[PDB]
Amino acid sequence: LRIIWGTNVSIQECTTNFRNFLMSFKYKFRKILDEREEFINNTTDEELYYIKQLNEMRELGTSNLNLDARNLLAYKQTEDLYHQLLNYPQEVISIMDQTIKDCMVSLIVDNNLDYDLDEIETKFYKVRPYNVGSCKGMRELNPNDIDKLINLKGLVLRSTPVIPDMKVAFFKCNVCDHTMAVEIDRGVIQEPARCERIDCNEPNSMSLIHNRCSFADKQVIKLQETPDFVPDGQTPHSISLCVYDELVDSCRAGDRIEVTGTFRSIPIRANSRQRVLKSLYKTYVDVVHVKKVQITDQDLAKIREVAAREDLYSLLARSIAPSIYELEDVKKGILLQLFGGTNKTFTKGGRYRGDINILLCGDPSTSKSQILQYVHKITPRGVYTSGKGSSAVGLTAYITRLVLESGALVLSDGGVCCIDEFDKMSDSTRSVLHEVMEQQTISIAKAGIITTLNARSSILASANPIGSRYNPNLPVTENIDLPPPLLSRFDLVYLVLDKVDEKNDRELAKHLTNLYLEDKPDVLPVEFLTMYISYAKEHIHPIITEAAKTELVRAYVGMRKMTATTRQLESMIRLAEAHAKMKLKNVVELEDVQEAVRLIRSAIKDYATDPKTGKIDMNLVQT
Amino acid sequence: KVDDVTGEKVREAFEQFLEDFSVQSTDTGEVEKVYRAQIEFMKIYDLNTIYIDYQHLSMRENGALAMAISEQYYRFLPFLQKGLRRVVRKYAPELLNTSSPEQTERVFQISFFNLPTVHRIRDIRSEKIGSLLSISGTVTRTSEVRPELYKASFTCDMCRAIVDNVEQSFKYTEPTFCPNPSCENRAFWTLNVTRSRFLDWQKVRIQENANEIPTGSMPRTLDVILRGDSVERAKPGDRCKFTGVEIVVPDVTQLGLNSGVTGLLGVRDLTYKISFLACHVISIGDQEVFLNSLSSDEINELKEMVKDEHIYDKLVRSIAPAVFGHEAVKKGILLQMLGGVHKSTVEGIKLRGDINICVVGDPSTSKSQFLKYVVGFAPRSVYTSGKASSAAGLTAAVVRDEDYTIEAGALMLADNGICCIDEFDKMDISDQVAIHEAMEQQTISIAKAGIHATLNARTSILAAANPVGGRYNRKLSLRGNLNMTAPIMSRFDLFFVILDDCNEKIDTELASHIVDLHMKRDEAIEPPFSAEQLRRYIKYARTFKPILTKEARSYLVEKYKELRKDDASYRITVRQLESMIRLSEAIARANCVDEITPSFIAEAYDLLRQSII
Numbered sequence A: 001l002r003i004i005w006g007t008n009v010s011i012q013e014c015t016t017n018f019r020n021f022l023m024s025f026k027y028k029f030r031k032i033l034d035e036r037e038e039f040i041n042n043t044t045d046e047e048l049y050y051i052k053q054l055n056e057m058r059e060l061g062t063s064n065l066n067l068d069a070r071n072l073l074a075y076k077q078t079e080d081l082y083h084q085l086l087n088y089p090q091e092v093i094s095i096m097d098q099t100i101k102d103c104m105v106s107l108i109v110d111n112n113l114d115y116d117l118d119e120i121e122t123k124f125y126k127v128r129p130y131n132v133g134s135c136k137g138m139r140e141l142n143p144n145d146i147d148k149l150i151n152l153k154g155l156v157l158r159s160t161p162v163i164p165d166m167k168v169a170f171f172k173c174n175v176c177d178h179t180m181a182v183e184i185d186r187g188v189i190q191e192p193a194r195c196e197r198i199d200c201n202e203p204n205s206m207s208l209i210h211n212r213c214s215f216a217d218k219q220v221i222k223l224q225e226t227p228d229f230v231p232d233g234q235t236p237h238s239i240s241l242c243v244y245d246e247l248v249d250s251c252r253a254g255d256r257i258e259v260t261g262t263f264r265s266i267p268i269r270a271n272s273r274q275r276v277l278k279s280l281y282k283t284y285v286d287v288v289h290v291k292k293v294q295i296t297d298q299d300l301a302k303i304r305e306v307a308a309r310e311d312l313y314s315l316l317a318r319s320i321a322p323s324i325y326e327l328e329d330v331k332k333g334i335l336l337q338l339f340g341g342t343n344k345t346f347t348k349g350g351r352y353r354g355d356i357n358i359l360l361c362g363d364p365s366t367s368k369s370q371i372l373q374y375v376h377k378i379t380p381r382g383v384y385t386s387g388k389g390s391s392a393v394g395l396t397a398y399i400t401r402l403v404l405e406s407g408a409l410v411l412s413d414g415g416v417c418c419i420d421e422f423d424k425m426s427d428s429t430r431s432v433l434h435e436v437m438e439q440q441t442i443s444i445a446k447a448g449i450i451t452t453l454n455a456r457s458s459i460l461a462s463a464n465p466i467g468s469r470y471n472p473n474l475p476v477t478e479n480i481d482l483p484p485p486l487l488s489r490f491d492l493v494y495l496v497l498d499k500v501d502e503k504n505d506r507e508l509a510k511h512l513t514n515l516y517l518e519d520k521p522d523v524l525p526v527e528f529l530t531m532y533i534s535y536a537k538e539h540i541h542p543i544i545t546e547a548a549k550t551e552l553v554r555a556y557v558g559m560r561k562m563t564a565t566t567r568q569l570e571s572m573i574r575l576a577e578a579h580a581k582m583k584l585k586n587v588v589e590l591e592d593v594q595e596a597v598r599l600i601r602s603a604i605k606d607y608a609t610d611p612k613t614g615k616i617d618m619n620l621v622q623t
Numbered sequence B: 001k002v003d004d005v006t007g008e009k010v011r012e013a014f015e016q017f018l019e020d021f022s023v024q025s026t027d028t029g030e031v032e033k034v035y036r037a038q039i040e041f042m043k044i045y046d047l048n049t050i051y052i053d054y055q056h057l058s059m060r061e062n063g064a065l066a067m068a069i070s071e072q073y074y075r076f077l078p079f080l081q082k083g084l085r086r087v088v089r090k091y092a093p094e095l096l097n098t099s100s101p102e103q104t105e106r107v108f109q110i111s112f113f114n115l116p117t118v119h120r121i122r123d124i125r126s127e128k129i130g131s132l133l134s135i136s137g138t139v140t141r142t143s144e145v146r147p148e149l150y151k152a153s154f155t156c157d158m159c160r161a162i163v164d165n166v167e168q169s170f171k172y173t174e175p176t177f178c179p180n181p182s183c184e185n186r187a188f189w190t191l192n193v194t195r196s197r198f199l200d201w202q203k204v205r206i207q208e209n210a211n212e213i214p215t216g217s218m219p220r221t222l223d224v225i226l227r228g229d230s231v232e233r234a235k236p237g238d239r240c241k242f243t244g245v246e247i248v249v250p251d252v253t254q255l256g257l258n259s260g261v262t263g264l265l266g267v268r269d270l271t272y273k274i275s276f277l278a279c280h281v282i283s284i285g286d287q288e289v290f291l292n293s294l295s296s297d298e299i300n301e302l303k304e305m306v307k308d309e310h311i312y313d314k315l316v317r318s319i320a321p322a323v324f325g326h327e328a329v330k331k332g333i334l335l336q337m338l339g340g341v342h343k344s345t346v347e348g349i350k351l352r353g354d355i356n357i358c359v360v361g362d363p364s365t366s367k368s369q370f371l372k373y374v375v376g377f378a379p380r381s382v383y384t385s386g387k388a389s390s391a392a393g394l395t396a397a398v399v400r401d402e403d404y405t406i407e408a409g410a411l412m413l414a415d416n417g418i419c420c421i422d423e424f425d426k427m428d429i430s431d432q433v434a435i436h437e438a439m440e441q442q443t444i445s446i447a448k449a450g451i452h453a454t455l456n457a458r459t460s461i462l463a464a465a466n467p468v469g470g471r472y473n474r475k476l477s478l479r480g481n482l483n484m485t486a487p488i489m490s491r492f493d494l495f496f497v498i499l500d501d502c503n504e505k506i507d508t509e510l511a512s513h514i515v516d517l518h519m520k521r522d523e524a525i526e527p528p529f530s531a532e533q534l535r536r537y538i539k540y541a542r543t544f545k546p547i548l549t550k551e552a553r554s555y556l557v558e559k560y561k562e563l564r565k566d567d568a569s570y571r572i573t574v575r576q577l578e579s580m581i582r583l584s585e586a587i588a589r590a591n592c593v594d595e596i597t598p599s600f601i602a603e604a605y606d607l608l609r610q611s612i613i
Helices: A011-022 A027-033 A042-046 A049-060 A069-074 A076-087 A089-111 A117-122 A297-308 A312-320 A328-339 A368-378 A392-396 A408-412 A427-439 A476-480 A484-489 A502-517 A526-539 A546-561 A566-582 A590-603 B005-020 B034-044 B054-091 B287-293 B296-307 B311-318 B327-338 B367-377 B391-395 B429-437 B486-491 B504-524 B531-543 B550-567 B574-590 B598-612
Strands: A064-066 A126-128 A149-159 A163-172 A179-183 A214-225 A238-244 A256-269 A277-287 A358-362 A382-386 A397-400 A403-406 A416-420 A442-445 A450-453 A458-463 A492-496 B049-053 B109-113 B132-142 B146-152 B154-156 B189-191 B197-207 B221-227 B239-250 B272-277 B280-282 B357-361 B382-385 B397-400 B404-407 B418-422 B444-446 B453-455 B460-465 B494-498
Touching: A011 A049, A011 A076, A011 A089, A027 A042, A027 A049, A027 A069, A049 A064, A049 A089, A069 A076, A076 A089, A089 A117, A089 A126, A089 A256, A149 A238, A214 A256, A238 A256, A297 A312, A297 A526, A312 A328, A312 A368, A312 A526, A312 A566, A328 A358, A328 A368, A328 A416, A328 A458, A328 A492, A328 A526, A328 A566, A328 A590, A358 A368, A358 A476, A368 A382, A368 A416, A368 A458, A368 A526, A382 A408, A392 A397, A392 A408, A392 A427, A403 A450, A408 A416, A427 A442, A427 A484, A442 B382, A476 A484, A476 A492, A484 A566, A492 A590, A526 A566, A546 A566, A546 A590, A546 B504, A566 A590, A566 B504, B005 B034, B005 B054, B034 B049, B034 B054, B049 B054, B054 B109, B054 B132, B054 B239, B109 B239, B109 B280, B132 B221, B197 B239, B221 B239, B287 B531, B296 B311, B296 B531, B311 B327, B311 B531, B311 B574, B327 B357, B327 B367, B327 B460, B327 B494, B327 B531, B327 B574, B327 B598, B357 B367, B367 B382, B367 B418, B367 B460, B367 B531, B391 B429, B429 B486, B486 B574, B494 B598, B531 B574, B550 B574, B550 B598, B574 B598
Parallel strands: A064 A126, A238 A277, A358 A458, A358 A492, A382 A416, A416 A458, B049 B109, B221 B272, B357 B460, B357 B494, B382 B418, B418 B460
Antiparallel strands: A149 A214, A149 A256, A163 A179, A163 A214, A214 A238, A256 A277, A397 A403, A442 A450, B132 B197, B132 B239, B146 B197, B154 B189, B197 B221, B239 B272, B239 B280, B397 B404, B444 B453
């Protein structure tokens, strides 16, 4: 038999265990390993999971086949093979790739569906085990763990450009015009000492030609250690993850990705020309699988029922921060911002941007930043920042030599942005934010490097009052202390002030004391509400209608009677489109525009605000 | 020596395609052996390059030739050149030679255009190397034309034996053995420039379109090699489509002249750098001469518009169709785009022919929208936001090139055209003073890094700004509302004032216009003239050079006296008179009148008085 070196386990036996997993292993085995028999379905269980997966790979036309170490453990012989893989991940992965190819050929013949066995041979099946082990940081990874299968979660610090890889060397003889191809094993090309052609009779006549040499796609992605894995006292250590073929560019940089792989250690040459290599070995992880960290039909039905409920707007507001008290209007504005307005692009007038930015000002103990962290959790992509920690250059763009790097707002783009101590945030940073928010995109010019980075990020800001506690005598805008251009740029302005009464104090103290009374203590689940916002954006594309247009023109003229920025009217339209997404209405309606204007009026306590100078009586706040 | 049967078949097929393409699309469906007739034309001009549409190859041989070319261009290129040489020897033997000194064989270039698919620089892959491909992108830079050693001739010092036209790899190469069998020399090879043949060489760096990037990320850059006629066939900063074979560049140091191949190099590793070779380059980015450049229908449309007596008002209305109101700003933009005749005194003082304006107004007035429309309309124009910009970098750039060199500035992108400036108030007053320093005198120059360089800096300037306090203050003087140099304000032709109108009718009209725009996209706008037609009219007017009349000069005298009376000081000056002359020339251009008129001078004085406010 053929045995992997040092394992005393046959490579044929590993392939046979993988074949028993691919066929003659029921999905019932994986479901039983998962237990939860009430959750498992008997018919899909009786069907063979890996047989269905190989047939699905044939239907896709792709050689790659996702692998589950849990399913490998579910099958008994495949569990033994998975332990052998944990010992020798690369060898067992090659064995499983060959087994997947052979099982695909056998499955094509068995199903009798049209397919080419030669096409299956040309295809190189891929085994991508996952759930082999608990996710761990790069700092947790060890040289003993090198050459052992593991599943790792990490946030991509950056993704490197695709790196050419010498899949096979090609030798072309300059003396005799001979053509040859030499496979590259272990990353080293093989060169015959004499000419491949005996008639040439020229020693070392063969010459490698790089263009003729076969190249396989390869890439690397820097991966930061997971925030839980990182030590509390120090920033996480980062190790780049090797990737190739379909795994290359599987996940974009700046988004969390879970890549199962085998850790690798390689000697580092003391000098590139010198054969000598330092006793220390550089360490990198080669990913057997790449994964992240879209609405299911049942989730979409649940979102539809929720959106049908009239209580759902306030329900999602409360669901953003279920434990928090008395900031439901700010949470509703944040939920509208998470839904976002629809974006319209035109040849003239540029492109109206649907993304909504929300500014919130609260006196200390407003729980505004607790709600902001709640919004960061609720957002599908979360960016949280402190005003003292915020920098304008970091928010817009950085340069490394000389190539531009994504700003903090650019990384926020594609998700909601959370800002704490927004009053403490620098006015210069806010001035940088003004242009980026007005354009919904960032443009940067600098010596050497000048480029524009997308900044289409919904922005949430939690701000202190300009006074240490919010002053009713102070104007609400002054208490928020936001610059007027940034306030116009923001779609929504939120004002929250504490109101004191004996019964209200009893209620607040009772809430805090109940959370304390538990030793560990209508709201949608936060993940379900993120999915609801995603489904609202996906299946709802609100646009200005006639009724919404009557409401919008009335609101614009009335706010001009009250001065109305044209951007505020666009922000009201975006909030109206956000409300239609919150209601899962395909187009903006008069009720949506009315709710958007009502949400803006309630957010800044404009109804509470006194008619003159914009100041709000404290009793008027919180009605 | 072994020979590729597929290569020889491809050479025969290419010769057959060239000699008997027999498809002529000229004036009718006809047969003229258009490739052979093009060979005859290249013989008439002694040309060395041939351009072939990829669709012609796709039609020829049922696309077998096109398929072979696309699949293995790198392999069949010598065979294609041999077939072209065979067709040349058959039809134009003079073209076969370089064509008194003995004529060497002429180099033959084959260009392929109109490829079915165009890929972004990010779309390129290592697997795509070695195959013909069309790439869409913008040329960030272009290397100087160089004589790449396509063919090398060496002489052996030991026995005086000489080699000729030796092919060279990516690194410089010498003959493996002495051509003389008796001499065993493998060194002492001395090149001869005359006997060796050098092709023109130029590397043009390219990058993906910033608009093409979805997430706004940095566009992927690709090196495009231009050789022969392809050298200087494109310009830096201009979008272009390149067609040719993708290539991989080995490390010259590893050859001896990240992971790397080894064991071939020998022990040394070899890292591969991706690149592109472009067989074909295409750029995707007097009144009588302009009329000839225009098609017959375009000439007829421009003639009708010029014949219209209301052409001036129609163009002013057509400016910024989406924008409602700001008709004075529209008229100023039209006058600036039309421009004025340059003039220089016998004493040597040179006046500026281009119009320059600065706009100050409250936010949410679509001044930035006007800047965007102007940047889109004006050829050779660049738009930028003032706050996120470098003052010196906009005017000029300097960098070291592999030695100190000079890089083109942002102002040069606006040269011979309008320059739009957004967030002008947010921009540095130092940058504003620099613009004033390079506005009337122009002539941007470099004196740093030990290298002195000159720049013409001939452009029109347009600006948008927010007045002090965030809104225009009518009580506040026109000068000082936007802090800028007084001489610069004087040299500026006009200072537009934008103020919000509380009129309910105007509010309802603007609201209805914005709502109709959002509902109906471009259909809501109804400009009197199309953008392309207005651009053609602007080009024709620029070809025209208005001349001052004697009555026009008397009217200008009276108008300057009236402006001085209005000063009765800082607001009006001889610079205001110069602005009046420039606006009169622009008005004569807009009205298509050959000469300046007293009515045109009156309109110029009215615009200046509107700036006075």
